[PDB]
Design an enzyme around this catalytic site. Sequence first.
Site, PDB file in Angstrom:
ATOM      1  N   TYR A 102       0.870  -1.297   0.072  1.00  0.00           N
ATOM      2  CA  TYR A 102       0.030  -0.055  -0.013  1.00  0.00           C
ATOM      3  C   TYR A 102       0.880   1.154  -0.096  1.00  0.00           C
ATOM      4  N   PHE A 144       2.316   9.815   3.144  1.00  0.00           N
ATOM      5  CA  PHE A 144       2.712   9.778   4.439  1.00  0.00           C
ATOM      6  C   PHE A 144       3.296   8.399   4.962  1.00  0.00           C
ATOM      7  N   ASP A 145       2.957   7.157   3.903  1.00  0.00           N
ATOM      8  CA  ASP A 145       3.586   6.053   4.305  1.00  0.00           C
ATOM      9  C   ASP A 145       3.358   5.189   3.203  1.00  0.00           C
ATOM     10  N   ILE A 160      -8.362  -0.048  10.064  1.00  0.00           N
ATOM     11  CA  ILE A 160      -9.590   1.132  10.100  1.00  0.00           C
ATOM     12  C   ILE A 160     -10.670   0.404   8.826  1.00  0.00           C
ATOM     13  N   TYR A 186      -9.512   8.330  10.861  1.00  0.00           N
ATOM     14  CA  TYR A 186      -9.001   8.819  11.782  1.00  0.00           C
ATOM     15  C   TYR A 186      -9.913   9.860  12.331  1.00  0.00           C
ATOM     16  N   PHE A 244      -5.571   5.468  -0.450  1.00  0.00           N
ATOM     17  CA  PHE A 244      -4.576   4.554  -0.580  1.00  0.00           C
ATOM     18  C   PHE A 244      -4.421   3.602  -1.728  1.00  0.00           C
TER      19      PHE A 244
HETATM   20  C1  818 Z   1       0.944   4.542  23.386  1.00  0.00           C
HETATM   21  C2  818 Z   1       0.286   4.233  24.741  1.00  0.00           C
HETATM   22  C3  818 Z   1      -0.398   5.561  25.097  1.00  0.00           C
HETATM   23  C4  818 Z   1      -1.205   5.328  26.402  1.00  0.00           C
HETATM   24  C5  818 Z   1      -1.234   6.151  27.568  1.00  0.00           C
HETATM   25  C6  818 Z   1      -0.644   7.272  27.605  1.00  0.00           C
HETATM   26  C7  818 Z   1      -2.174   5.470  28.728  1.00  0.00           C
HETATM   27  O1  818 Z   1      -1.401   6.005  29.926  1.00  0.00           O
HETATM   28  C8  818 Z   1      -3.558   6.346  28.733  1.00  0.00           C
HETATM   29  C9  818 Z   1      -4.136   6.304  30.031  1.00  0.00           C
HETATM   30  C10 818 Z   1      -4.334   5.688  27.626  1.00  0.00           C
HETATM   31  C11 818 Z   1      -5.268   4.323  28.262  1.00  0.00           C
HETATM   32  O2  818 Z   1      -4.394   3.421  28.678  1.00  0.00           O
HETATM   33  C12 818 Z   1      -4.930   2.455  29.736  1.00  0.00           C
HETATM   34  C13 818 Z   1      -6.236   3.709  27.266  1.00  0.00           C
HETATM   35  O3  818 Z   1      -7.457   4.824  27.409  1.00  0.00           O
HETATM   36  C14 818 Z   1      -8.588   4.188  26.769  1.00  0.00           C
HETATM   37  O4  818 Z   1      -8.829   3.136  27.476  1.00  0.00           O
HETATM   38  C15 818 Z   1      -9.565   5.389  27.098  1.00  0.00           C
HETATM   39  O5  818 Z   1     -10.509   5.498  28.040  1.00  0.00           O
HETATM   40  C16 818 Z   1      -9.482   6.548  26.231  1.00  0.00           C
HETATM   41  O6  818 Z   1     -10.303   6.481  25.051  1.00  0.00           O
HETATM   42  N1  818 Z   1      -8.786   7.682  26.241  1.00  0.00           N
HETATM   43  C17 818 Z   1      -7.903   7.733  27.486  1.00  0.00           C
HETATM   44  C18 818 Z   1      -8.155   9.126  28.422  1.00  0.00           C
HETATM   45  C19 818 Z   1      -8.186  10.102  27.191  1.00  0.00           C
HETATM   46  C20 818 Z   1      -9.110  10.053  26.143  1.00  0.00           C
HETATM   47  C21 818 Z   1      -8.715   8.678  25.373  1.00  0.00           C
HETATM   48  C22 818 Z   1      -7.780   8.980  24.321  1.00  0.00           C
HETATM   49  O7  818 Z   1      -7.638  10.050  23.896  1.00  0.00           O
HETATM   50  O8  818 Z   1      -6.747   7.787  24.582  1.00  0.00           O
HETATM   51  C23 818 Z   1      -5.466   8.250  23.570  1.00  0.00           C
HETATM   52  C24 818 Z   1      -5.837   7.197  22.538  1.00  0.00           C
HETATM   53  C25 818 Z   1      -5.914   5.939  22.285  1.00  0.00           C
HETATM   54  C26 818 Z   1      -5.705   8.030  21.158  1.00  0.00           C
HETATM   55  C27 818 Z   1      -5.844   7.490  19.646  1.00  0.00           C
HETATM   56  C28 818 Z   1      -4.482   7.831  19.232  1.00  0.00           C
HETATM   57  C29 818 Z   1      -4.302   7.270  17.754  1.00  0.00           C
HETATM   58  C30 818 Z   1      -5.288   8.216  16.935  1.00  0.00           C
HETATM   59  O9  818 Z   1      -5.251   7.972  15.666  1.00  0.00           O
HETATM   60  C31 818 Z   1      -6.598   7.900  17.253  1.00  0.00           C
HETATM   61  O10 818 Z   1      -7.663   8.745  16.830  1.00  0.00           O
HETATM   62  C32 818 Z   1      -9.037   8.106  16.595  1.00  0.00           C
HETATM   63  C33 818 Z   1      -6.995   8.093  18.902  1.00  0.00           C
HETATM   64  C34 818 Z   1      -4.181   7.877  24.437  1.00  0.00           C
HETATM   65  C35 818 Z   1      -4.257   8.676  25.604  1.00  0.00           C
HETATM   66  C36 818 Z   1      -3.109   7.693  23.461  1.00  0.00           C
HETATM   67  O11 818 Z   1      -3.027   9.125  22.858  1.00  0.00           O
HETATM   68  C37 818 Z   1      -1.627   7.704  23.914  1.00  0.00           C
HETATM   69  C38 818 Z   1      -1.568   6.160  24.056  1.00  0.00           C
HETATM   70  O12 818 Z   1      -2.149   5.222  23.386  1.00  0.00           O
HETATM   71  C39 818 Z   1      -8.372   4.151  25.160  1.00  0.00           C
HETATM   72  C40 818 Z   1      -9.700   3.220  24.680  1.00  0.00           C
HETATM   73  C41 818 Z   1      -7.304   2.937  25.061  1.00  0.00           C
HETATM   74  C42 818 Z   1      -5.860   3.467  25.795  1.00  0.00           C
HETATM   75  O13 818 Z   1      -4.683   2.621  25.739  1.00  0.00           O
HETATM   76  C43 818 Z   1      -4.242   2.847  24.301  1.00  0.00           C
HETATM   77  C1  818 Z   2       0.674  -1.385  17.407  1.00  0.00           C
HETATM   78  C2  818 Z   2       1.483  -1.334  16.215  1.00  0.00           C
HETATM   79  C3  818 Z   2       0.439  -1.818  14.817  1.00  0.00           C
HETATM   80  C4  818 Z   2       1.718  -1.628  13.618  1.00  0.00           C
HETATM   81  C5  818 Z   2       1.803  -2.307  12.787  1.00  0.00           C
HETATM   82  C6  818 Z   2       1.137  -3.817  12.548  1.00  0.00           C
HETATM   83  C7  818 Z   2       2.496  -2.008  11.385  1.00  0.00           C
HETATM   84  O1  818 Z   2       3.148  -2.939  10.715  1.00  0.00           O
HETATM   85  C8  818 Z   2       1.507  -1.488  10.265  1.00  0.00           C
HETATM   86  C9  818 Z   2       2.050  -1.344   8.963  1.00  0.00           C
HETATM   87  C10 818 Z   2       1.331   0.200  10.643  1.00  0.00           C
HETATM   88  C11 818 Z   2       1.759   1.357   9.898  1.00  0.00           C
HETATM   89  O2  818 Z   2       3.299   1.158  10.599  1.00  0.00           O
HETATM   90  C12 818 Z   2       4.302   1.542   9.871  1.00  0.00           C
HETATM   91  C13 818 Z   2       1.303   2.672  10.119  1.00  0.00           C
HETATM   92  O3  818 Z   2       0.321   2.715   9.007  1.00  0.00           O
HETATM   93  C14 818 Z   2      -0.252   4.099   9.077  1.00  0.00           C
HETATM   94  O4  818 Z   2       0.766   4.830   8.581  1.00  0.00           O
HETATM   95  C15 818 Z   2      -1.225   3.853   7.608  1.00  0.00           C
HETATM   96  O5  818 Z   2      -0.675   3.804   6.474  1.00  0.00           O
HETATM   97  C16 818 Z   2      -2.457   3.521   8.001  1.00  0.00           C
HETATM   98  O6  818 Z   2      -3.582   4.312   8.319  1.00  0.00           O
HETATM   99  N1  818 Z   2      -2.772   1.981   7.881  1.00  0.00           N
HETATM  100  C17 818 Z   2      -1.997   0.721   7.598  1.00  0.00           C
HETATM  101  C18 818 Z   2      -2.342  -0.008   6.650  1.00  0.00           C
HETATM  102  C19 818 Z   2      -3.483  -0.494   6.985  1.00  0.00           C
HETATM  103  C20 818 Z   2      -4.527   0.576   7.151  1.00  0.00           C
HETATM  104  C21 818 Z   2      -4.146   1.554   8.344  1.00  0.00           C
HETATM  105  C22 818 Z   2      -4.718   1.045   9.494  1.00  0.00           C
HETATM  106  O7  818 Z   2      -5.499   0.293   9.641  1.00  0.00           O
HETATM  107  O8  818 Z   2      -3.532   1.192  10.779  1.00  0.00           O
HETATM  108  C23 818 Z   2      -3.937   0.354  11.963  1.00  0.00           C
HETATM  109  C24 818 Z   2      -4.296   1.484  12.654  1.00  0.00           C
HETATM  110  C25 818 Z   2      -3.192   2.519  13.034  1.00  0.00           C
HETATM  111  C26 818 Z   2      -5.376   1.588  13.398  1.00  0.00           C
HETATM  112  C27 818 Z   2      -5.924   2.187  14.597  1.00  0.00           C
HETATM  113  C28 818 Z   2      -6.043   1.284  15.795  1.00  0.00           C
HETATM  114  C29 818 Z   2      -6.658   2.039  16.836  1.00  0.00           C
HETATM  115  C30 818 Z   2      -8.200   2.397  16.336  1.00  0.00           C
HETATM  116  O9  818 Z   2      -8.707   2.944  17.737  1.00  0.00           O
HETATM  117  C31 818 Z   2      -8.082   3.311  15.375  1.00  0.00           C
HETATM  118  O10 818 Z   2      -9.569   3.688  15.218  1.00  0.00           O
HETATM  119  C32 818 Z   2      -9.549   4.753  14.300  1.00  0.00           C
HETATM  120  C33 818 Z   2      -7.278   2.675  13.967  1.00  0.00           C
HETATM  121  C34 818 Z   2      -2.543  -0.484  12.213  1.00  0.00           C
HETATM  122  C35 818 Z   2      -2.562  -1.574  11.021  1.00  0.00           C
HETATM  123  C36 818 Z   2      -2.832  -1.064  13.650  1.00  0.00           C
HETATM  124  O11 818 Z   2      -3.945  -1.754  13.722  1.00  0.00           O
HETATM  125  C37 818 Z   2      -1.691  -1.931  14.240  1.00  0.00           C
HETATM  126  C38 818 Z   2      -0.600  -1.023  14.867  1.00  0.00           C
HETATM  127  O12 818 Z   2      -0.611   0.111  15.086  1.00  0.00           O
HETATM  128  C39 818 Z   2      -0.938   4.617  10.154  1.00  0.00           C
HETATM  129  C40 818 Z   2      -1.293   6.146   9.875  1.00  0.00           C
HETATM  130  C41 818 Z   2      -0.079   4.510  11.256  1.00  0.00           C
HETATM  131  C42 818 Z   2       0.616   3.073  11.494  1.00  0.00           C
HETATM  132  O13 818 Z   2       1.593   2.815  12.474  1.00  0.00           O
HETATM  133  C43 818 Z   2       0.703   2.781  13.952  1.00  0.00           C
END
Ligand code: 818
Ligand code: 818
EC number: 5.2.1.8
Lengths: 107, 107
Positions: A26, A36-37, A56, A82, A99
């Site tokens: 992809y 971006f990737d 996603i 996202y 993509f």
């Molecule tokens: C790398 C580890 C790092 C983990 C920590 C700092 C832990 O200390 C925190 C206490 C997180 C909690 O860990 C127990 C846990 O909180 C949930 O249970 C929850 O209640 C939740 O929804 N929260 C947490 C409280 C603030 C609002 C929200 C959030 O904003 O959470 C953020 C979240 C998941 C954002 C997504 C980021 C990717 C974007 O693309 C996507 O955009 C759609 C949104 C979370 C703070 C991330 O920024 C940072 C992390 O993930 C999540 C269901 C899953 C999450 O675990 C992962």
């Molecule tokens: C734990 C590490 C684990 C990482 C791997 C397996 C790596 O091998 C993959 C190659 C991921 C890539 O790593 C270089 C990188 O891909 C991006 O660059 C991208 O192009 C992207 O958008 N992709 C990846 C290709 C499939 C579609 C999409 C996605 O579905 O990605 C998924 C994604 C981020 C889902 C969010 C999960 C939390 C939900 O709450 C939220 O719901 C809103 C959606 C990704 C596959 C996760 O399931 C699993 C992971 O994160 C993301 C911008 C950021 C991501 O890095 C994190």
Amino acid sequence: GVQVETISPGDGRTFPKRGQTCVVHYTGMLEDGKKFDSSRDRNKPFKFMLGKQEVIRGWEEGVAQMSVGQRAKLTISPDYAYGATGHPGIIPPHATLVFDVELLKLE
Amino acid sequence: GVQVETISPGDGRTFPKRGQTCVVHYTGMLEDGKKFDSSRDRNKPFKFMLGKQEVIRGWEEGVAQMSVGQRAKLTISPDYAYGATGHPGIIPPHATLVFDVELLKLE
Ligand SMILES: CC[C@@H]1/C=C(\C)[C@@H](O)[C@H](C)C[C@H](OC)[C@H]2O[C@@](O)(C(=O)C(=O)N3CCCC[C@H]3C(=O)O[C@H](/C(C)=C/[C@@H]3CC[C@@H](O)[C@H](OC)C3)[C@H](C)[C@@H](O)CC1=O)[C@H](C)C[C@@H]2OC
Ligand SMILES: CC[C@@H]1/C=C(\C)[C@@H](O)[C@H](C)C[C@H](OC)[C@H]2O[C@@](O)(C(=O)C(=O)N3CCCC[C@H]3C(=O)O[C@H](/C(C)=C/[C@@H]3CC[C@@H](O)[C@H](OC)C3)[C@H](C)[C@@H](O)CC1=O)[C@H](C)C[C@@H]2OC
């Protein structure tokens, strides 16, 4: 939702079933084409399964409409990607993603 | 978007500014009240900063409307949370989230 536009046709007969491993290449871009990737850059395909929240939603719904060997552009609305948050420091709030995906094989 | 409903009032004068560290206690639930996470259970507050994509957008917009010491319920629409995807094995696709949040201090 997701819009699928075909670049090269697939076999027209083997579509991904939940529980199968999809192997793809992809490239992710914003609507203006800014990249971006890419798994192509890493020389390693990306593997995932349908039905396990591994990707996603726009991918879950878009890839299911592709057949083996097909190359397509998936245009995904923000809620199927996202949403209003974006992806930290990579994708901004409310972005539609594009993509270029190639379905290499099912295993 | 996000709806803020106050349980206990804040000071009415100190609101979070981008660049400040927010210290909070939260409980996350589905609309039927089912709890999925709580910082209270861990005995440790959660700390984050506004303006850095550190939290889902519903929090970025909801917490900014709270003042120190306020306890509020934040109701967040799916696009301002995890949209059509959800959060793997915890939150289902298209879920509105409810967080009980308390703003303990700004630092
Ligand atoms: C790398 C580890 C790092 C983990 C920590 C700092 C832990 O200390 C925190 C206490 C997180 C909690 O860990 C127990 C846990 O909180 C949930 O249970 C929850 O209640 C939740 O929804 N929260 C947490 C409280 C603030 C609002 C929200 C959030 O904003 O959470 C953020 C979240 C998941 C954002 C997504 C980021 C990717 C974007 O693309 C996507 O955009 C759609 C949104 C979370 C703070 C991330 O920024 C940072 C992390 O993930 C999540 C269901 C899953 C999450 O675990 C992962
Ligand atoms: C734990 C590490 C684990 C990482 C791997 C397996 C790596 O091998 C993959 C190659 C991921 C890539 O790593 C270089 C990188 O891909 C991006 O660059 C991208 O192009 C992207 O958008 N992709 C990846 C290709 C499939 C579609 C999409 C996605 O579905 O990605 C998924 C994604 C981020 C889902 C969010 C999960 C939390 C939900 O709450 C939220 O719901 C809103 C959606 C990704 C596959 C996760 O399931 C699993 C992971 O994160 C993301 C911008 C950021 C991501 O890095 C994190």
